[PDB]
Amino acid sequence: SFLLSKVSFVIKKIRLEKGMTQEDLAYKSNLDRTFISGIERNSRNLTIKSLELIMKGLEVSDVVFFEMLIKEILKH
Amino acid sequence: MESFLLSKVSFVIKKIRLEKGMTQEDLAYKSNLDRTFISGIERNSRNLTIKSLELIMKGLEVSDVVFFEMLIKEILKHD
Ligand code: NA
Secondary structure: OHHHHHHHHHHHHHHHHOOOOHHHHHHHHOOOHHHHHHHHOOOOOOEHHHHHHHHHHHOOOHHHHHHHHHHHHHOO | OOOHHHHHHHHHHHHHHHHOOOOHHHHHHHHOOOHHHHHHHHOOOOOOEHHHHHHHHHHHOOOHHHHHHHHHHHHHHOO
8 A cells, every 4th residue: 555655654754753652652642552563564554533543642733744645645 | 522534534535526426336336345335434434444545546536645635625624
């Protein structure tokens, strides 16, 4: 999945710019650590509702997240 | 309450579907997904995976970028 790889990269990019570890993000998203780790290794098929929990955990605005996603897609 | 992003994703799928002249059944046929899953999405009653969204975008003949532009606009126009 090309789009899953891009969404996963943006997640990681924002997590790392905020200084959060995977455990920090798991906790704030109310998701399991091993699920966050799986997403970032591009090895898990994320839903829209889980994506929203991750955006809330990151405290990133929905519009900003999708602008970043578009930028990353356009690199290709 | 219900997921904001899910309701907006759902709404953009329906909007594009109708702009292309397609029925729910048509979109199911072209996405290779069950018609009852299409219908559930649009009634804001079904979550979907990123990979199902990609199949829907292929059924809609819309690029990822155009889909996300439309999503951004619909989020902005919500108050
Ligand atoms: Na839905």
